[PDB]
Amino acid sequence: ALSDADVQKQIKHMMAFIEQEANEKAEEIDAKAEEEFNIEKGRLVQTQRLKIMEYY
């Protein structure tokens, strides 16, 4: 609003909201990435194990 004090405070608050969401989202993204790492790796590995089983 009109007062610089108020608008500056509002900006600090907004940036804080922007940062909090950004921070949470990045951690979320990395966590899911790790989950998928293990899941996908296993999926492909087991697929190959079955293929090798057939060669056997």
Binding site: A1, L2, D6, V7, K9, Q10, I11, H13, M14, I18
Partner: protein, 78 residues
């Protein structure tokens, strides 16, 4: 942030009514036009002094869009 151009007749309430959409949520953009052209709707030349709220969020940007458009304001540029 996208500041509009207004006839400045109601920038008092333009700004306050936008504040209250989500108060203090985005920074106020102040823009002014000196020696303007005649307003298209009223054919009247009058300096613009506009306090604008612009939001990143889609729900709130849509909200302020509705609020600022209900008000006699021009939001032409992006």
């Amino acid at each position: 942030f996208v500041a509009g151009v207004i006839n400045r007749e109601r920038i008092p309430t333009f700004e306050r009514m936008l504040w209250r959409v989500c108060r203090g949520n985005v920074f106020l953009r102040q823009a002014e036009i000196e020696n303007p052209l005649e307003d298209p709707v009223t054919g009247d030349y009058v300096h613009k002094s506009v306090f604008i709220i612009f939001f990143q969020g889609d729900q709130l940007k849509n909200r302020v869009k509705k609020i600022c458009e209900g008000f006699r304001a021009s939001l032409y540029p992006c």
